[PDB]
Design a protein around this ligand. Structure first.
Ligand SMILES: N[C@@H](CCC(=O)N[C@@H](CS)C(=O)NCC(=O)O)C(=O)O
Ligand SMILES: N[C@@H](CCC(=O)N[C@@H](CS)C(=O)NCC(=O)O)C(=O)O
Ligand SMILES: CC/C=C\C[C@H]1C(=O)CC[C@@H]1CC(=O)O
Lengths: 216, 569, 216
């Protein structure tokens, strides 16, 4: 069976995996619950043969999968991009750690509490974390070298995320923007932005205090 | 003061007296273009009863590389002409290239005077086969919105623009042409893309009376109606409410429309029902306007692949080919409006320039000795050489034409040129490989709004400290300004050559400036280039322009959708 | 130059790692920084040169890496575990991921002020994922094996910790208690459970209103 990816009608944790399919030119199929189909999969949860009910899930010829951490790993390696050493798949995961803590970080409470009040305390601790990737990247085109990679894709989602959060988040580290554009530079992913599959927003769940609603 | 048959009379008598009139005009340029030390050290001194034959062997031919240094003088800091005549009001970039570099030709007053006269001959001959209403207006895609000041403090400008912004534009064209849909202010408007849809809207507002639809070539109309096909629902929603959309940011265009904006629910209903009913958007031009006579533009040479799609848009209506002319000079005119575009051919104007022709025939190519235009043999192909008042003396464009026939004693021509390309080595390189990857790289962010890039260019600015960047971009539709800023940064890191990229990184060359020119700009310079007096096949676009290039230069500073210096560094 | 794992005296991110350094029978040394060594936090990170700044940190004689989840797969590959294997890498991670939802879920609440209501509902939402784990375990002794892997103690930390906050959450899952019984049964871990190195509390940094503080 050909690759089947299911996810919420949001970019979400699923942007890096959908985006990684296209840099890799991997072809995929999509089943997405719309405005109220999320509840319907109740009956479908234990009848899917899936080990642990949730989204995303992944039915192919070879395996039954779910969750963002796991799916990114499984797809990339078959296509030779999960990592090459004890040191660097770790480095990958660490860089994953860096984007996720900041991204799962915006999402602690972006659809919860007063996001603006909690914005200020987190936008108080972010400069170091943002400044770390900009200093490491001066000699390399991206974080790890010369061919675009998946840490960059959650990172792509990432850069979008503090900038929609805070427009002038990025006033003092200019390198990241040209760099996002260089990962965005690959022809195929551009065309899918061009194509019908591209969904600009919301990044998080539909009902979000911040980043929520059908229309910006 | 235009008389329809009297202007054709001047042309008709002229075609009959072509030989005498031409040697006189040869004498004219010789009497006029003289005292530049270039002409005299080439040997010229004036007059005699010996002005033609001795001249051709004695006085030397020119190419773009040799022509490059002397206006280079004029454009840079100090206006210092030595090969043309007067210090030029504006300079013109010529098509093809100079060893991979920008081409140089001066633009004079006579052309604007020649513009009025050639066109005057054109539409009058057209009017005998296509009678017109004198009180009507026309739908024309003509833009003169961009002007720049040279490093030398001199204006540089495309042929077309220089004419439109000239003090004599209105008096010279009041009697002889049907009014533009768009106000002149809108033809001069900072946003030609926005001017493009509003002038188009302007057309629909007076659809019953319009007699023309105009651009210089076919594919520009083509892209326009794709846009119309793309944004027509956008047009009618604006009309129902009577409010112009928020996509539109430019100061002059929104105020024009606000005055022209009255709630019209009904028009939007009429247009919407009619527009959706048609199949596969083939030929919408007469439908939108019930009384228009024709579609006008260039339809030969490189335009042949674009002829079916203009035909696609044209349908069963007669196709009229625009006269063949340029910033170098005006060379030919269509005096047979009834004939189709494929068999169409353009009449040489006797008094505008001395044309001699470099022989192609015996093998490939040829160095056979040249002959006069009327002295040229029927049915054979030769590459034109031009001596005129644009400071061009024996200038080889590099392009070959065939003789279809004769309006009396003056030849009509067909141009099978679709590429004249020959090249050498460029030192603003930065090759196309790298530029194409770079422009394409920065392209995706705009593409998030389903908009794609039409065209690209770059510039060498020695007015500024330091010499630097300057990028041109044409896209299908309007977009916000912040995505563009970031695009500038990709372009900033995209060019990868050691010298350039090291300087770029530490701003030894200034931080990249991104200015978004409006749509059809490059299309308009393409308009100029195919018409280049020679063999109608001359459109290959220089991708980075020296202080030395020219069409592109006028364009860069004012007509900015937005202008931003690097959001990097 | 014995390998350094550097971290606070807290369960948190490092808890799976400590016991597990002993599974591979690998040499290691510790730097213990206290609640009162917050002054140490400002002054240590870039003085030894971290590109990506975070706790916990672990340096083998040649490696530089942080972030709990990243540290774990690091330990596993040194134990020749990746190479790659798909299902399990994606299934370990899924298994791990259900618990990351559990582990970070408690960490979400970890800095929260109320705690009790978030936990009981965290408790209300625990039987789903545990049942997903439960329906994995019965044919064999533990979560995915015969003789201990890395994913064990994390669910354990998760399940151990959750047992402390509520005494009867594991009552309905008999297979899971053998599971609890099984790892305290293997020689190295129970033997070191009574040693000085063993760390039981607090669950999060002492700042947490619950699972912080002092007493089990
Ligand atoms: N931490 C877990 C949980 C992530 C998560 O919340 N996934 C959502 C999709 S955005 C889900 O599966 N929800 C299932 C539901 O609707 O109950 C993971 O990374 O997969
Ligand atoms: N995802 C990251 C986030 C880790 C994190 O926030 N760590 C805390 C320790 S629990 C920290 O270093 N805090 C800095 C401090 O309190 O000084 C990871 O797991 O390493
Ligand atoms: C009267 C000529 C004025 C300007 C130049 C151009 C137009 O306005 C339409 C085409 C015409 C000829 C060309 O292509 O050189």
């Amino acid at each position: 069976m050909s690759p089947i990816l299911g996810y919420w009608k949001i970019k979400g944790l699923v942007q890096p995996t959908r985006l990684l399919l296209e840099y890799l030119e991997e072809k995929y199929e999509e089943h997405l619950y719309e405005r109220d189909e999320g509840d319907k999969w109740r009956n479908k949860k234990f009848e899917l043969g899936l080990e642990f009910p949730n989204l995303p899930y992944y039915i192919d010829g070879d395996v039954k999968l779910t969750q963002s951490m796991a799916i990114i790993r499984y797809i990339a390696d078959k296509h030779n991009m999960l990592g090459g050493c004890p040191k660097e798949r770790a480095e990958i995961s660490m860089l994953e750690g860096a984007v996720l803590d900041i991204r799962y970080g915006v999402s602690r409470i972006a659809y919860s509490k007063d996001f603006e009040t909690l914005k200020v305390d987190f936008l108080s601790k972010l400069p170091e974390m943002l400044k770390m990737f900009e200093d490491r990247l001066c000699h390399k085109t991206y974080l790890n070298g010369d061919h675009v990679t998946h840490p960059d894709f959650m990172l792509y989602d990432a850069l979008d995320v503090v900038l929609y959060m805070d427009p002038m988040c990025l006033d003092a580290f200019p390198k990241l923007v040209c760099f996002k554009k260089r990962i965005e530079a690959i022809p195929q992913i551009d065309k899918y932005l061009k194509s019908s599959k591209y969904i600009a927003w919301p990044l998080q769940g539909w009902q979000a205090t911040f980043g929520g609603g059908d229309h910006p | 003061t235009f008389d329809m048959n009297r202007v054709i009379d001047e042309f008709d008598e002229m075609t009959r007296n072509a030989h005498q009139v031409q040697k006189q005009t040869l004498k004219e340029i010789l009497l006029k273009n003289q005292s530049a030390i270039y002409l005299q050290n080439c040997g010229l001194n004036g007059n005699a009863t010996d002005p033609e034959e001795a001249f051709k062997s004695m006085v030397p031919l020119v190419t773009d590389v040799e022509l490059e240094p002397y206006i280079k003088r004029m454009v840079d800091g100090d206006t210092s002409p030595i090969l043309t005549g007067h210090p030029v009001p504006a300079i013109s970039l010529s098509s093809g290239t100079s060893q991979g570099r920008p081409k140089f030709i001066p633009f004079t007053d006579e052309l604007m005077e020649n513009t009025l006269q050639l066109f005057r001959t054109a539409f009058a001959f057209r009017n005998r086969d296509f009678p017109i209403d004198d009180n009507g207006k026309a739908l024309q895609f003509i833009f003169s919105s961009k002007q720049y000041i040279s490093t030398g403090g001199v204006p540089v400008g495309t042929a077309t623009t220089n004419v439109y912004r000239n003090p004599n534009f209105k008096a010279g064209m009041k009697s002889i042409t049907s009014p533009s849909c768009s106000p002149d202010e809108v033809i001069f408007s900072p946003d030609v893309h926005q001017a493009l849809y509003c002038h188009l809207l302007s057309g629909i507002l007076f659809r019953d009376q319009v007699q023309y639809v105009f651009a210089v070539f076919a594919h520009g109309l083509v892209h326009a109606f794709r846009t119309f096909e793309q944004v027509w629902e956008e047009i009618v929603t604006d009309i129902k409410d009577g409010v112009l959309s928020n996509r539109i940011t430019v100061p002059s265009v929104r105020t024009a429309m606000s005055k022209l904006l009255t709630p019209n629910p009904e028009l939007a209903e009429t247009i919407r029902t009619k527009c959706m009913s048609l199949s596969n958007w083939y030929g919408l031009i007469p439908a939108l306007f019930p009384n228009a006579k024709y579609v006008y533009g260039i339809m030969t040479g490189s335009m042949e692949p674009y002829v079916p799609k203009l035909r696609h848009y044209a349908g069963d209506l007669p196709l009229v080919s625009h006269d063949y002319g340029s910033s170098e000079g005006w060379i030919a005119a269509n005096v047979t409006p009834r004939l189709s575009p494929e068999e169409a051919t353009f009449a040489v104007i006797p008094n505008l320039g001395y044309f001699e022709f470099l022989p192609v025939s015996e093998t490939g190519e040829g160095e056979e000795k040249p002959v006069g235009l009327t002295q040229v043999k029927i049915g054979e192909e030769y590459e034109v050489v031009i001596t005129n008042y644009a400071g061009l003396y024996r200038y080889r464009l590099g392009d070959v034409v065939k003789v279809i026939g004769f309006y009396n004693n003056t030849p009509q021509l067909k141009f099978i040129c679709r590429r004249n390309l020959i090249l050498s080595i460029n030192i603003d390189k930065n090759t196309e490989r790298d530029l194409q990857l770079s422009v394409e790289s920065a392209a995706k962010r705009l593409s998030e709004e389903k908009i794609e890039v039409i065209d690209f260019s770059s510039y060498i600015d020695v007015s500024t400290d330091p010499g630097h960047y300057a990028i041109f971009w044409e896209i299908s539709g309007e977009t916000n300004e912040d995505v563009l800023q970031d695009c500038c940064n990709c372009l900033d890191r995209a060019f990868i050559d050691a010298g350039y990229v090291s300087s770029r990184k530490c701003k030894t060359i200034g931080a990249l400036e991104l200015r978004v020119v409006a749509k059809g700009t490059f299309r308009k310079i393409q308009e100029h280039f195919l018409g280049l007096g020679s063999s109608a096949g001359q459109f290959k676009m220089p991708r980075c322009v020296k202080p030395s290039n020219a069409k592109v230069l006028q364009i860069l500073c004012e007509n900015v959708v937005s202008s931003y210096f690097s959001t990097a560094f």
